[PDB]
Design a protein that fits this description.
The structure is a homodimer.
Chain A (H helix, E strand, L loop, with lengths): L3 E9 L6 H10 L4 E3 L1 H6 L5 E3 L11 H4 L4 H17 L3 H4 L5 E6 L5 H11 L4 H5 L3 H4 L4 H7 L8 E5 L4 H14 L5 E8 L3 H8 L31 E9 H6 L6 E10 L10 H11 L8 E3 L6 H15 L5 E3 L2 H4 L6 H15 L1 E2 L16 E2 L4 E2 L4 E8 L3 E8 L3
Parallel strand pairs in A: 4-5, 4-6, 9-10, 9-14, 10-12
Antiparallel strand pairs in A: 1-7, 1-8, 2-3, 6-7, 8-15, 11-13, 14-15
Helix pairs in contact in A: 1-16, 4-9, 10-16, 13-14
Bound molecules: ammonium ion (NH4) (2 copies).
One ammonium ion (NH4) binds next to strand 14 of chain B.
Chain lengths: 405, 406
């Protein structure tokens, strides 16, 4: 069947508003975490986040942005970057049945769903709500808000699977190319950052709460003193393209998606089973004749979760384990956008021949014993890289990307 | 070239809590719409809804239901029925890497997103939120709350595409079968019914508001006096199974999914273009050389939308227009749960040989002249049926199902 490659990328994250700023941040191990007055004022215990530092005012036409929540805004900007980076013009991708879009968010828009209810409960009711809340809230906001202004005619929907969201979007995009249904599928996602949603995670005891005085050190994946994840917002989009179609137009090909694993734990609602991850990673490596050189781990900086993945990694590789780093230590956990942002961080490592450092590890965790956790920006000629995304509900996604031959 | 068939179904809707109650409603042209004091008290203009008439208390283990919003509950109850209907023992589908679940909702849980925020702003803060709001409020709630209790090991995620949601879930499940990745995929969706979400629709003018005194008359697809859809909730699940796997275990097969269209309008944010729908139905019909005997329309009872669909149907079928009925006039529009529920109503019509009536058409819209809109229950041997789901954001899905020989 058909092979799929990535021919363009775009990103708006806590560590950079485009691939150049993100590349700079990754090489220097710069943290995108800051103190959040909004979270403190809301009454939360976690006072830090991986916020997008960008004034998006006037970046999107009013008639388009009026329908959008922040998740869509971020994904929209990311898609604009990916389209340019791919060297694509309207004539090639708009009004074309063979071009699609699969992009989602993990939470939709808790901020606008709450704005809707607050406004409706006020004296103006429906008038205060306005006619734009359905497209801002609504789990498919990200796909709907982008497909329309970009004149997408092919496939159009959102997949959501919590933290694995945008990784499943990419994988489904790959399947569309393999099934011969689409020549190009823009795949990614976005996630707003707001106390409305962050508090649900804090109420769950899932967010870091001991490092509010030193934001940049709160996300500390693999560190013995990790106490939860730092929530983040952002967006990402990659252009997934059928190989012959890409070669035929002289596209710049970052890599081929040679493996995609999607499995389920069928065990715990919030913690990973590990058994699911093992199968997912193996499914993704199946048939890949080259070793994994780098693995961007799921590790969100939580006690059990970090340990569960490492064990799964040991089970899959043994002593032949790849270089490992958790960019989450610098970026925070962007939920729905995490899969595509991490697939991007990984393509930038594959593209620029380096491994970003897993920062804030002051004392490695006993579980990471027989594994190579890279903690300093390291130059290396990577060929095959893997990225794991494991979300609540026991849902797993692993993407394997390789330089083309 | 693997083929996908439906071997079990389950449903919780405004017109029945299982396929038997639903079958009766369909044949009787029975409305599931009722007056809603909750919508009225919330300040909405639309005071009618297609509510699930069932108290779900205690039907799900306390430790499982604690993570669930209503969409997940409806979907869970639906999947239990689907599993029993498919004759699948636990050993046949649990802890099995070749068995998956793709199910979603259009809105996740606006009720719980709002609850978490209201609680957080109150005197107990985090303590009032509780540790279960995430799995209730997240967009993948429906897949997450089911995959876990049912011990699903294969694919696990939700697709969300507004009104087309569960129809894309079914199509994606077919794709897993065709890719040879799964032997069985449970596909479906659920949607809660609450003023928190409903007012958003009312605020954009999408809901019927002129028939609150006669709730059963508010949903009237194709009627000249339609004035918006009637929101509903509920769930549905079908067992999508690879054909060889179904035949080997003696599965009862309702039909084969012989066509699946998924397209995008790339035009207007809330109005259909018609053009995408045309491509969607044509894509679903590719290589299907039997005629469409019955088409379950998307027609949600809106002025603009009902006609764009009729125009698309006219374009796709020309002279070979199939019999058509909008079960929506009876059920209301269940958003994320609609695609699977209408696929199920279509399968029931196919299994039992009848076409359910498109009720409440007191004055047929002029642009519907010449089509075969069925307005009275009609017995007829059906072989191939089509069901459309066209949602906001210009997202389209069409499913074509066909009876197998013997
Ligand atoms: N990752
Ligand atoms: N339908």
């Amino acid at each position: 069947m058909k092979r799929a490659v990535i021919t363009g990328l775009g990103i708006v994250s806590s560590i950079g508003n485009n691939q150049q700023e993100v590349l700079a941040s990754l090489r220097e191990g710069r943290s995108g975490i800051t103190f959040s007055q909004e979270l403190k004022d809301s009454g939360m215990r976690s006072h830090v986040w991986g916020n997008v530092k960008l004034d998006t005012t006037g970046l999107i036409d009013r008639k388009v942005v009026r329908f959008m929540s922040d998740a869509s805004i971020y994904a929209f900007l990311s898609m604009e970057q990916a389209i340019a980076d791919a060297g694509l013009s309207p004539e090639a991708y708009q009004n074309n049945p063979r071009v699609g879009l699969i992009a989602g968010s993990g939470g939709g828009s808790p901020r606008f769903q709450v704005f809707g209810a607050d406004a409706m409960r006020g004296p103006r009711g429906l008038k205060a709500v306005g006619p734009y809340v359905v497209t801002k809230a609504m789990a498919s906001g990200v796909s709907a808000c982008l497909a329309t202004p970009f004149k997408i005619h092919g496939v159009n929907y959102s997949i959501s699977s919590a933290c694995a969201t945008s990784a499943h979007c990419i994988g489904n995009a790959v399947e569309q190319i393999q099934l011969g249904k689409q020549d190009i599928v823009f795949a990614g996602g976005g996630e707003e950052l707001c106390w409305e949603m962050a508090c649900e995670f804090d109420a769950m005891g899932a967010l870091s709460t001991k490092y509010n005085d030193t934001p940049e050190k709160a996300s500390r994946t693999y560190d013995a003193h990790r106490d939860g994840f730092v929530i983040a917002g952002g967006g990402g989009m990659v252009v997934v393209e059928e190989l012959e179609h890409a070669l035929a137009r002289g596209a710049h090909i970052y890599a081929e998606i040679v493996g995609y694993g999607a499995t389920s734990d069928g065990a715990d609602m919030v913690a990973p089973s590990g058994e699911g991850a093992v199968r997912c990673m193996k499914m993704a490596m199946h048939g890949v004749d080259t070793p994994i050189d780098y693995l961007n781990s799921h590790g969100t900086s939580t006690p059990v979760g970090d340990v569960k993945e490492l064990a799964a990694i040991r089970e899959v590789f043994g002593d032949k384990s790849p270089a490992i780093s958790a960019t989450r230590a610098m970026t925070g956990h962007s939920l729905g956008a995490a899969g595509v942002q991490e697939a991007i961080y990984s393509l930038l490592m594959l593209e620029h021949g380096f491994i970003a450092p897993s920062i804030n590890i002051e004392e490695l965790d006993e579980q990471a014993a027989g594994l190579n956790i890279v903690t300093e920006t390291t130059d290396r000629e990577l060929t095959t890289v893997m990225s794991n995304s494991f979300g609540f509900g026991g849902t797993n996604a692993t993407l394997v990307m390789r330089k083309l031959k």
